[PDB]
Design a binder for these strands. Structure first.
Ligand code: ZN
Lengths: 225, 116, 375, 333, 111
RNA sequence: GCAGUCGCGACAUUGCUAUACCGAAGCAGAAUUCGGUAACCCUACUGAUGAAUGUUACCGCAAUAGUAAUUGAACUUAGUACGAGAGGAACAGUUCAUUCGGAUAAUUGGUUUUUGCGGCUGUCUGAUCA
């Protein structure tokens, strides 16, 4: 279930890739192992789009979407938008968002039914997210954290958050989401869980430097087995 | 590639020309030339400057709103790359440009009341 | 400090070191001018000796400061007083340092050479001790340590080789090993290290293991034999165990055994010991003992998943995404999109079903003339 | 500066000459070793970057390129060079006999007063049954197996005030020098276009004379490892078009090149800024050594070509853009 | 930024200004060693590595655009890019964002 | 240096007073060390004119002289060999960065006698454009 991979000898999986229940996204790179791992874990199950967003290698921190839709940031060029439309099936909606804080991957953390959004998000963007993705608007700051999209990773089976999350905040957020949440480190103490790992309803991806206790905690929370 | 409308003049600007300014507000302060960039920095508001389309359209020196300009919408979604759409766009764009060019002189004549 | 040393400077013989220093100072080259040149030549000589002595002192760990167990091990392997005398000699050597000018330069050079030559014996001892100290076992007292002890190797080395991947000699001759053999492994996400004892029957080999057991926190497993193996008598093994008990019972002791039954079970007098019967070749009881030893240390809007997932089982050249990105047909998969036309982006004036919009032209063209703009 | 480029004496002539030729194989067919042109300014290009393993792989890049007008080059003669223990010696030269007024002017320093009698008696050997040309060709066939062909440019076609043509020697890489001379026989008096020899993305080197800066500059210089971007021809519609923009416009910018005429004929676009100023004659050699590096082997797909005015600061790309943006003007109405 | 210059900072840590002592000239994404005077003892009076996120000077990105930022700002981080600040104010250049994933992750706005 | 042990007494002897390439060291990997290839002035300086090659011109060859490129980073191969673990190679092909050298102003820019523009000012015209 849980697979360990690396990009350019780095554990920033959440920065160099993005995953969803109906598709996966990866950045441009010369390493064939990065694509091979995703192909083996998913293969024909869902498409794996090898492409960039705004010409950046931080596609993981730029993309913000679920299996229902994909709200690309402002920096997404017309050519990139056309390529994404061609790569993705018509079943998945694609739309661009004009935002002064368009780092959507870090600003917004969302799953197939709920979208955690940094209070700095605008009402228009939150309403568009709720409409297109069919998810609730959750203006929250996890235990005072500012970048939920970078310090959290929500799946339909469970959620992972940064270690410093308070027990009361974790319990309240888990009750609101109707799914369990666990606070833990990734990539041997990396507090940026959202940037260090990605997860979906059936697959978890982490860095090759993830320790055994961290891997066990991740597996227990996400209940992939 | 992308051609950007100048903030100070609204004219098209191509890549590799001029210098863009990135303010803390993170907005595309793109300008065609250093002259326009410096005018914007000095705050020679285009709506008050005689030689910019922003002022001309507002004051009626040129056509303000028309069908030829409304169709220039920033589409939020792409298209599925159909040849019929490309052919229709090729047929329509030249005629729309010619119509807008003629309507520019039409608006000039309309404003020319007193000498027309 | 990490218990694995390789940065310790190499110690060359006294003659070799003197020759190297002489060559280096020779290569790195009026009354006042001659005196200054000779003084510079004299000065450039002792700097190398001082630097080498300081480097040796820094590299060589202090026997009496690192740890009591390390001190005991160093003393057992090499005479502690001899090592201290060698260090003192090194420190003493480091701290000691026209025609008349040439004679004075020769005097200084020869004094340094004679000091180095007299330092040959301490240098020879230093080289020999360095050639063995560096790769010493990486024992970590603060970690979770499990010790295997008993009479000479009956085959228990196989148990350690199985619990940890560190290969160890298992030949059954009189004395297999002559030093501590350590192997790391993981249990319940917790690190453990297993250390083997060459054999307890004095001799330095047995003394090293005894000192390690005494001075290192660990959980210990004593090995005995019920079969013909191990040579020594069960009575002798029991006597040795009882004699060692006073300083070894408190170390979380377990017993592994590879009128006989009564004699073997009589060892149960020790309160905290648990006895397990196994063999060096079987697997069931070996795994049971491994698990027991591992545990002893601690004792002391529902989700949606596509059905296709369950059915799944498993930079010099450029790669094209054709046949990877999807379109209505393979024939027109080429990206012939111009994306720019007459200086205007295609997307700026590209919309679906624009044929209806094209209809407005039929009246907009007439509006050019009949609207009164020009005629 | 580097001692290799010293002394700093002025160049022998403005028309730099190639000092080395590509290695020849006795099996490959006939092919020219070099070409010539005139640097008609420079421009800016934007193109995709499909280079693998690059920090900007699959992205778009912008760079500067040099445009060289290369009109058809007409052959006028062929020369054989014999090897000796004292170097190469010009054994024989045979001309096409169809020497133009341009080459006559080149040979005559004050043509306006010269009687223009050059190449009158020699024309007799060709304007009859002859067989002297055949004898010379057989002599060349039997003798040295290295052959060079003399050619000159159609300076009249080029928009330049010099009006004087320049002679240039080009080697041939075809084996069986009998075949080389036979090909020269059939191509005598003929003009060769640009696309015959070079191809897109090919790696070449260029030689020219640098601009003088006051002595400062004014020396022959060679820049190697330049990639050919485009080979445009006058008969090729929309020489400045690309796959993406596909605009029906020529590489000539609004108002033409600064200090140069509006090029509307054959030209070559290559990577980098080849030495030499505007109107300077340059020569292009075809990669004396067959480099197999990925940089040479990679291909380039042009996206768009800059065509805005160079004098001053370009306001628009094409004339249609400026008047369309303006709408109407007193200058018009 | 010229060598040895004093510049501002954009991280949300206990530091506001930096003073370059070594350079590893300076530009967007460059790493330098600097001390802090305007701030708190957590970072003040001690040398730390900083990475430049804004240049304030015009430069041509390989994407084919000439651009320049408003003010010169940096972010304090260890040599391996472990930025202490959980968030960065203002925009961050693409060159630095792609070079340091952590900076891009903690950056509110990129380009 | 003095003294002594070995008729003059040869070596031993004791007392005090940068990179790159090779073989090795107990070189597991990395790193390190040792020994080698060894890194109002002469002559001036340089640009340039120049009596004579039967005349001029084109194409050329080359005797001779100078010579250059250097350093660092990432991937692949690697978290593989190796290794109790910590840690961790290299070759084969690619992608980049700094110093130096040769060229360009397509864009940008420090800078203007377009000795260009419009306003203003000094001053001054029948007062007012200027
Ligand atoms: Zn403008």
């Amino acid at each position: 279930m849980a697979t360990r991979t690396q990009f350019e000898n780095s554990n920033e999986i959440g920065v160099f890739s993005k995953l969803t229940n109906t598709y996966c996204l990866v950045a441009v790179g010369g390493s064939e192992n990065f694509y091979s791992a995703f192909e083996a874990e998913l293969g024909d199950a869902i498409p794996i789009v090898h492409t960039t967003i705004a010409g950046t290698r931080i596609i993981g921190r730029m993309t913000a979407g679920n299996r229902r839709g994909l709200l690309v940031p402002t920096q997404t060029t017309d050519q990139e938008l056309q390529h994404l439309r061609n790569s993705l099936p018509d079943s998945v909606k694609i739309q661009r968002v004009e935002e002064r804080l368009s780092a959507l991957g870090n600003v917004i953390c969302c799953n197939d039914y709920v979208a955690l959004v940094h209070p700095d998000i605008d009402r228009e963007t939150e309403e568009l997210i709720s409409d297109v993705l069919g998810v609730e608007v959750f203006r929250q700051t996890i235990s005072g954290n500012i970048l939920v999209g970078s310090y959290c990773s929500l799946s339909n089976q469970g959620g992972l958050v940064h270690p410093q999350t308070s027990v009361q905040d974790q319990e309240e957020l888990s009750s609101l989401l109707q799914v369990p949440l666990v606070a833990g480190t990734v990539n041997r103490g990396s507090s940026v869980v959202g940037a260090g790992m990605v997860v979906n309803d059936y697959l978890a991806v982490t860095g090759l430097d993830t320790t055994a206790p961290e891997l066990s905690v991740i597996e227990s929370i996400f209940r992939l087995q | 590639m992308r051609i950007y409308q100048c903030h100070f003049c609204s004219s098209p600007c191509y890549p590799g020309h001029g210098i863009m300014f990135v303010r803390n507000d993170a907005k595309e302060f793109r300008f065609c030339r250093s002259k326009c960039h410096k005018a914007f920095k000095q705050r020679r508001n285009p709506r008050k400057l005689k030689w910019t389309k922003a002022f001309r359209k507002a004051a009626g020196k040129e056509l303000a709103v028309d069908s030829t300009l409304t169709f220039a919408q920033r589409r939020n979604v792409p298209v599925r790359y159909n040849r019929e759409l490309v052919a229709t766009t090729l047929k329509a764009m030249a005629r729309i440009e010619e119509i807008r060019q003629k309507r520019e002189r039409a608006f000039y004549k309309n404003r020319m009341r007193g000498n027309k | 400090m990490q218990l694995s040393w390789k940065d310790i400077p190499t110690v060359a013989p006294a003659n070799d070191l003197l020759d190297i220093v002489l060559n280096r100072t020779q290569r790195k080259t009026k009354i006042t001018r001659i005196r200054a040149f000779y003084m510079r030549k004299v000065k450039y000589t002792g700097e190398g000796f001082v630097e080498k002595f300081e480097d040796i002192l820094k590299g060589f760990p202090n026997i009496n400061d690192v740890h009591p167990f390390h001190r005991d091990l160093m003393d057992t392997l090499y005479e502690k007083n001899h090592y201290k005398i060698s260090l003192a000699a090194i420190s003493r050597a480091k701290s000691l340092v026209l025609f008349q000018c040439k004679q004075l330069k020769r005097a200084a050079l020869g004094r340094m050479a004679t000091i180095v030559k007299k330092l040959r014996d301490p240098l020879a001892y230093l080289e020999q001790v360095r050639q063995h100290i560096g790769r010493l076992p990486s024992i970590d007292p603060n970690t979770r340590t499990l010790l295997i002890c008993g009479y000479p190797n009956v085959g228990k080395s196989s148990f350690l080789r199985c619990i940890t991947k560190s290969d160890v000699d298992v030949q059954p001759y009189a004395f297999t090993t002559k030093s501590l053999y350590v192997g790391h492994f993981d249990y319940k996400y917790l690190r453990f290290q297993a250390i083997d004892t060459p054999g307890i029957l004095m001799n330095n080999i047995e003394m090293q293991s005894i000192y390690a057991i005494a001075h290192l926190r660990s959980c210990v497993l004593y090995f005995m034999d019920l079969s013909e193996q191990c040579g020594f008598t069960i009575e002798a093994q029991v006597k040795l165990f009882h004699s060692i008990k006073p300083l070894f019972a408190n170390k979380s002791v377990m017993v592994v055994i590879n009128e006989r039954a009564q004699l073997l079970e009589s060892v149960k007098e020790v309160p905290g010991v648990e006895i397990m019967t196994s063999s060096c070749q079987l697997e069931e009881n070996v795994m049971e003992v491994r698990n027991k030893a591992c545990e002893k240390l601690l004792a002391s809007r529902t989700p949606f998943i596509p059905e296709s997932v369950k059915n799944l089982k498993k930079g010099v050249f450029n790669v094209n995404l054709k046949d990877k990105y999807l379109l209505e047909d393979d024939e027109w998969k080429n990206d012939i999109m111009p994306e720019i036309l007459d200086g205007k982006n295609v997307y700026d004036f590209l919309d679906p079903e624009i044929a209806a919009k094209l209809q407005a032209l039929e009246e907009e063209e007439e509006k050019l003339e009949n609207e009164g703009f020009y005629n | 500066g580097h001692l290799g480029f010293l002394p700093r004496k002025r160049a022998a002539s403005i028309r730099a000459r190639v000092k080395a030729f590509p290695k020849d194989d006795r099996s490959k067919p006939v092919a020219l070793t070099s070409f010539l042109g005139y640097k008609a300014g420079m421009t800016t290009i934007v193109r995709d970057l499909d280079r693998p393993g690059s920090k900007f792989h699959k992205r778009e890049v912008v760079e500067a390129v040099t445009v060289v007008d290369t009109p058809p080059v007409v052959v006028v003669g062929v020369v054989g060079y014999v090897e000796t223990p004292r170097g190469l010696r010009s054994l024989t030269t045979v001309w096409a006999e169809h020497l133009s007024d341009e080459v006559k002017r080149r040979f005559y320093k004050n043509w306006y007063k010269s009687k223009k009698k050059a190449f009158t008696k020699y024309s007799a050997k060709y304007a009859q049954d002859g067989a002297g040309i055949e004898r010379e060709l057989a002599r060349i066939k039997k003798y040295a197996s290295v052959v060079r062909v003399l050619v000159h440019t159609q300076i009249r076609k080029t928009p330049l005030a010099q009006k004087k043509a320049h002679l240039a020697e080009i080697q041939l890489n075809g084996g069986s020098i009998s075949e080389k001379v036979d090909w020269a026989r059939e191509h005598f008096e003929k003009t060769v276009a640009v696309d015959s020899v070079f191809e897109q993305n090919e790696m070449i080197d260029a030689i020219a004379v640098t601009k003088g800066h006051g002595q400062r500059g004014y020396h022959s210089r060679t820049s190697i490892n330049h990639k050919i971007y485009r080979v445009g021809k006058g008969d090729d519609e929309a020489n400045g078009a690309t796959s993406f923009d596909r605009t029906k416009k020529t590489i000539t910018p609004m108002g033409g090149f600064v200090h140069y005429g509006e090029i509307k004929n054959d030209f070559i676009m290559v990577k980098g800024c080849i030495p030499g100023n505007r109107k300077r004659i340059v020569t292009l050699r075809k990669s004396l050594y067959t480099n197999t590096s990925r940089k040479a082997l990679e291909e380039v797909s042009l996206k768009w070509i800059d065509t805005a005015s160079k004098f001053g600061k370009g306001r628009f790309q094409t004339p249609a853009e400026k008047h369309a943006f303006m709408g109407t003007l007193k200058k018009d109405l | 930024l010229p060598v040895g210059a004093i510049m501002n900072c954009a991280d949300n840590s206990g530091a506001r200004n930096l003073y370059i002592i070594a350079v590893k000239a300076a530009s967007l994404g460059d790493m330098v060693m600097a001390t802090v005077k305007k701030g708190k003892p957590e970072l003040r009076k001690k040398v730390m590595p900083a990475i430049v996120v804004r240049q304030a000077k015009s430069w041509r990105r390989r994407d084919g655009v000439f651009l320049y930022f408003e003010d010169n700002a940096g972010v304090i981080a260890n040599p391996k890019g472990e930025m202490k600040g959980s968030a960065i104010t203002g925009p961050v250049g693409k060159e630095c964002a792609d070079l340091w994933p952590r900076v891009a992750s903690n950056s509110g706005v990129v380009v």
